[PDB]
Write a protein that binds this ligand. Structure first.
Ligand SMILES: Nc1ncnc2c1ncn2[C@@H]1O[C@H](CSCC[C@H](N)C(=O)O)[C@@H](O)[C@H]1O
Ligand SMILES: Nc1ncnc2c1ncn2[C@@H]1O[C@H](CSCC[C@H](N)C(=O)O)[C@@H](O)[C@H]1O
Ligand SMILES: C[C@@H](C(=O)C(=O)O)c1ccccc1
Ligand SMILES: C[C@@H](C(=O)C(=O)O)c1ccccc1
Ligand SMILES: O=C(O)[C@H](O)Cc1ccccc1
Ligand SMILES: O=C(O)[C@H](O)Cc1ccccc1
Ligand SMILES: [Ca+2]
Ligand SMILES: [Ca+2]
Ligand SMILES: [Ca+2]
Ligand SMILES: [Ca+2]
Ligand SMILES: [Fe+3]
Ligand SMILES: [Fe+3]
Lengths: 339, 335
């Protein structure tokens, strides 16, 4: 019962006010997550704003602002000095990493819409995002949205692996969680990013897997041109989550898939997981993330393959898709079990 | 408090999408799209992208964000104004302010709230962007009350001073209305001064209107060549809250009094902090203005606070105008 074309002035005032306050609420979701407040509310159901502000050493006027923003749209409810969870808390909290990703992570790009859209401006470094904030968001995105299907695919391997290479390894939590499932297994993360190596080795060292899991720097689209080559022969499980769309355009994907095939010829299973572009979803029925993901990629000039485009690329890439998993529900996201 | 799981999905999806809508409104305003939709009721994105030399897929995204909350509707490459177009287009400059102007502040909420961080230049805003939005906010929301106040001055100014002069447009319009008038702008920012000097010169007012770099809070320290004595009309719009806290405001009001001994009327327009509006009934702007200033550590007075400060500050409020409707905003006529 949504799509009217004609409304009262009163309705339009309220609607436009809501969009405005949604913006502040949106940013506040990610911030309340990162400052601990969404967790207190999840656990205790309620909190005392002054008490919260003191405990965490926060400027209280601004802390009232954050909660009022959440409350302007029903995520929480304010009662005197108390904030309780509101009718929309669970959903918002479930998707809190997506909001963080939108604001804290990608705000700078969406803010500069008017500078970024002009063609004369689109070369070299023409936008900025917060790498550390994205990383922070993508850690929970990976867990909350991709783990079930990732683990489901690991359960369906039909063999117990021995050496697992992970493309776009970032934090290293993927490899680490593998280590624990398959006691003896060794691992080899790969990034095109320097602070991913360090953050990982530190986190690896921090959990007792230093002796096994090592890392490397290299663009995974040209993995043959990476000095770790020699060890790629012993690897019997490849993985690649939240970065496959970078392999594109199509022809560069084909190439990259082919080159990966040769560089890892002992790989039995290759688990590939990513979000895809949607098609034909109606403007007023777009779910969370979809618009953010697609629109931001369109602004960065980065290509986003639809799900069909992935499907029709694997053969030529030198791979066969033997199982496919739908993600709940990070737009249209998928896990492919390739071999 | 009780809703279905599907209502909840939809509402959270709307909040997410609104974020991108909010940002798009300011972009669309800036890039010509809203003006083009006011006139023709429609627009073609291919046509549009081309005319403006913009990356069309990003242009489609922009319009899909606005379509996603009913500001416009899409019919293939044909955008038609939506059910909320008039209201959104009306407040476009407020959305601009929120996102393009003040986006970096609200983005860094996690870094900006911890007291430890609250020293130095702990936040950032886009001066160019903000300035760009305040031009329209000034004209769209304050002008009616502003010109009503000028009509009922009870005299005709000979020399006007404008505090936080910005673009210089207020002084230009004053000169258009009163052709013999001398004009004087104080702004604390070299960039405003330079821009205003430009515009004033370009338009042919270089003789009448001139500018000095200054902090209106300590107006008593601004050299100005003795010209403050000749001023008989004082204007100050959209910066008065920076006089606060209260003891500072009383002081700044006494110093304005003294620096401008021949001012007959002092016209002061600002938005104020509201009280007791229920969370789910906040109108546009109110939350962003208040929340942002709390984040920046800047005091925002209520209207009653303003009313209660004038006497101790050396002035008598003789006329008050309500503004429609930029949160609770007002123009005071002081003497
Ligand atoms: N072409 C490329 N080659 C190697 N690494 C890349 C890359 N493009 C992006 N990356 C890296 O991939 C990571 C994206 S986030 C990775 C999430 C991780 N797979 C997880 O689910 O926990 C970042 O660390 C980024 O630096
Ligand atoms: N202490 C201070 N003294 C003088 N100007 C100040 C100030 N603090 C901020 N400003 C200026 O006040 C302006 C806010 S924008 C308002 C512009 C103008 N009053 C108008 O009606 O359109 C900016 O130009 C800023 O540089
Ligand atoms: C990492 C992020 C992404 O592509 C981006 O931030 O550009 C992403 C990828 C896939 C699913 C969710 C988020
Ligand atoms: C200039 C702006 C403001 O306070 C700010 O940008 O910080 C403002 C003041 C008063 C009414 C509307 C906007
Ligand atoms: O082509 C597809 O639809 C998927 O890429 C993989 C798949 C194919 C056939 C049977 C199962 C999975
Ligand atoms: O105190 C007030 O109410 C206003 O600040 C000024 C005013 C007072 C009386 C008559 C008109 C205006
Ligand atoms: Ca298919
Ligand atoms: Ca000074
Ligand atoms: Ca002087
Ligand atoms: Ca009063
Ligand atoms: Fe991406
Ligand atoms: Fe201000």
């Amino acid at each position: 019962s949504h799509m009217s074309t004609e409304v009262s002035e009163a309705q339009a005032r309220r609607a436009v006010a809501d969009i405005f306050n949604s913006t502040l609420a949106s940013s506040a979701i990610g911030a309340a997550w990162e400052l601990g407040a969404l967790d207190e509310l999840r656990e205790n159901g309620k909190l005392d704003v002054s008490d919260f502000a003191v405990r965490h050493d926060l400027h209280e006027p601004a802390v009232v602002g954050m909660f009022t923003a959440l409350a302007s749209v029903g995520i929480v409810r304010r009662e005197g000095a108390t904030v309780v969870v509101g009718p929309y808390f669970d959903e918002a909290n479930h998707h809190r990493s997506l909001f963080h990703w939108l604001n804290q992570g990608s705000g700078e790009l969406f803010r500069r819409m008017p500078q970024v859209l002009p063609n004369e401006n689109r070369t070299g470094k023409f936008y900025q995002r917060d790498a550390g904030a994205i990383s922070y968001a993508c850690r929970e995105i990976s867990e909350r949205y991709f783990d079930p299907a990732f683990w489901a695919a690991v359960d369906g391997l039909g063999y117990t692996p021995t050496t697992v290479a992970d493309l776009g390894s970032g934090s290293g939590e993927r490899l680490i969680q593998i280590a624990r499932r398959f006691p003896g297994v060794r691992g080899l993360g790969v990034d095109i990013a320097d602070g991913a190596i360090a953050m990982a080795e530190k986190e690896v060292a921090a959990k007792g897997f230093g002796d096994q899991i090592s890392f490397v720097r290299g663009d995974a689209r040209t993995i043959d041109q990476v000095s770790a080559r020699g060890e790629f022969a012993e690897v019997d499980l490849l993985t690649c989550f939240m970065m496959g769309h970078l392999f594109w355009p199509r022809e560069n994907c084909v190439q990259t898939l082919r080159k990966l095939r040769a560089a890892f010829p002992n790989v039995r299973r290759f688990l590939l997981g990513d979000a895809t572009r949607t098609v034909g979803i109606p403007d007023r029925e777009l779910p969370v993330f979809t618009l953010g993901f697609e629109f931001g990629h369109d602004m960065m000039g980065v290509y986003l393959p639809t799900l069909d485009e992935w499907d029709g690329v694997f053969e030529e890439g030198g791979w066969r898709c033997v199982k496919k998993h739908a993600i709940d529900s990070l737009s249209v996201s998928v896990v492919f079990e390739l071999e």
